[PDB]
Amino acid sequence: MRLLYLHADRFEYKTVKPALKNPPDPPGEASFGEALVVFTTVEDGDGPQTVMYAASDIASHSSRLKVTTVILYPYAHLSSRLAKPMAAHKRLIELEGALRTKFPGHVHRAPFGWYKSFSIACKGHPLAELSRSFTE
Amino acid sequence: MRLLYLHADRFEYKTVKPALKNPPDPPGEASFGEALVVFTTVEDGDGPQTVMYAASDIASHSSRLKVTTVILYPYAHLSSRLAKPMAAHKRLIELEGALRTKFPGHVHRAPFGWYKSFSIACKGHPLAELSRSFTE
Ligand SMILES: Nc1ncnc2c1ncn2[C@@H]1O[C@H](CO)[C@@H](NC(=O)[C@@H](N)CO)[C@H]1O
Ligand SMILES: Nc1ncnc2c1ncn2[C@@H]1O[C@H](CO)[C@@H](NC(=O)[C@@H](N)CO)[C@H]1O
């Protein structure tokens, strides 16, 4: 699993066209104020262990930034060892559940399987942009 | 070299704190309307050949999107095989020059070696977000 942590002043997205034959989540849109936006690429061989490590780290980074909202944003573009869409969806669902066991704030999992438009204002501080990998 | 192509409706950035002891470019800020924003991570072993392949591809993708502005945005976070900062800066300078030989529109190389704040509104169409790697 490959992740990009973006500490945002604000974030919003809207699904547009389906990116998969049949997206496993319904379409939608949401917007937020200050949040950690976690661009999440599920990789082949990610399993429950991988999810749990990632959940703990997101939690720990969120605490360090004093943020109370995390967006789990499915992203197909952070690596060249993608898991297939069904495995990917499953792991993102597990990640959402796992994060709630480690982090007390708002967790928003954005829909999987769509192209999206988005807008973000990413903060300038030294820890506002970082990437992290997890495996098992 | 690892790149992320974001077709934006608008883009802006501002350097904040120096991210390197002595950043090789001066601080600054710019904003744009419709542009291809190329988050660019220089990797160990990128050379002139790598640059030229990347320049041709950016050019060809820009043409396909009918965009006339490309932002070359130094980004340290797209892979785990980073070139050292001096090699990285050099390659980004080469990339800027190479792109101008292949693409007729506005090429803006954003400064290297700073933390930055940025804001982007990324389009929803199917080719609005893609990643590409180049090597030699
Ligand atoms: N291995 C993987 N990890 C994370 N997400 C993955 C995935 N495989 C498929 N997806 C999802 O399906 C959409 C099309 O690839 C993806 N959509 C996106 O990447 C949009 N942000 C592009 O606008 C994503 O929702
Ligand atoms: N291998 C590499 N490829 C591309 N850029 C690289 C690099 N090594 C260092 N940099 C630059 O130095 C800043 C701190 O890493 C980097 N700054 C950034 O990545 C900001 N957008 C974070 O806010 C970047 O300008």
Numbering used by the authors:
A (entry chain A), B (entry chain A): 1 to 136
Give verbatim excerpts from the published study on this entry.
We have been interested in a D-aminoacyl-tRNA deacylase (DTD) fold that is present across the domains of life in two different functional contexts: as an N-terminal editing domain (NTD) of archaeal ThrRS, which specifically removes non-cognate L-serine mischarged on tRNAThr, and as a freestanding ‘chiral proofreading' enzyme, which removes D-amino acids from tRNAs in bacteria and eukaryotes. Both share a striking structural and mechanistic similarity highlighting a common ancestry. Here we show, with the help of structural, biochemical and biophysical studies from three distant organisms, that the substrate specificity in this domain is determined by a differential remodelling of the catalytic centre at the RNA–protein interface rather than just the presence or absence of catalytic water as previously proposed.
To understand this intriguing mechanism of cognate substrate rejection in NTD, we have solved high-resolution crystal structures of ApNTD, as well as NTD from Methanococcus jannaschii (MjNTD) in complex with non-cognate and cognate substrate analogues L-seryl-3′-aminoadenosine (L-Ser3AA) and L-threonyl-3′-aminoadenosine (L-Thr3AA), respectively. The carbonyl oxygen of the substrate has a water-mediated interaction with His83 in PabNTD, while the same atom interacts directly with the corresponding His77 in ApNTD and His84 in MjNTD. Therefore, to ensure that the loosening of interactions observed in ApNTD is significant, we solved multiple high-resolution crystal structures of this enzyme with L-Ser3AA and L-Thr3AA to obtain random snapshots of the substrate analogue in the active site.
